[PDB]
Amino acid sequence: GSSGSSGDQDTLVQRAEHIPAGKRTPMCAHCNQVIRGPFLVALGKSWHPEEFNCAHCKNTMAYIGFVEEKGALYCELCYEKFFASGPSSG
Ligand SMILES: [Zn+2]
Ligand SMILES: [Zn+2]
């Protein structure tokens, strides 16, 4: 065996594990309905790859990342936009 318990610093932006069909048929979080096909497991729960969308830009948050805040998922874009308030030309 070996030892670890060590890691590097990274951004909060988390991701969802794309689960294939057949593997498992958990219960969605939004609609709360048994999933037959592939689902996304994140935040300690499952969701539909068709509904799973941002809270502001309501965009597909399957590939891109997302950040939770007081019960709200914000894609890296939204976050970096609000959170990481960089310099504004105007
Ligand atoms: Zn659903
Ligand atoms: Zn967004």
Q: What is the CATH number of the domain that holds 64?
A: 2.10.110.10
Say whether 46 sits in a helix, a strand or coil: strand
Q: How far is the CA of 70 from the centre of ligand 2 (A)?
A: 15
Q: Which domain holds residue 41?
A: 12-83
Please tell me the experimental approach by which this structure was elucidated: NMR
In 3D, which of 27, 62, 63 has the Cα closest to residue 45? 27
Proximal ligand: closest to the CA of 54: 2
Structurally, the chain folds into a number of domains equal to: 1
Task: List, in order, residues 6 or more apart from 3 with CB less than 8 Å away.
Answer: none
**CA 11, chain centre distance (Å):** 13
**CA 62, chain centre distance (Å):** 7
Proximal ligand: closest to the CA of 74: 2
Q: How many separate helices (H) and strands (E) can be counted in the chain?
A: 1, 5
Instruction: Flag whether 5 is in a domain.
Output: no
Proximal ligand: closest to the CA of 55: 2
The tokens describing 13, both together, are 């932006």
Q: How far is the CA of 82 from the centre of ligand 1 (A)?
A: 28
Q: How far is the CA of 22 from the centre of ligand 1 (A)?
A: 17
28 Rama sector, left if φ>0, alpha if ψ -120 to 50, beta otherwise:
beta
Instruction: Flag whether 7 is in a domain.
Output: no
Contact assessment for residue 37 and residue 21, using Cβ atoms and an 8 Å cutoff: yes
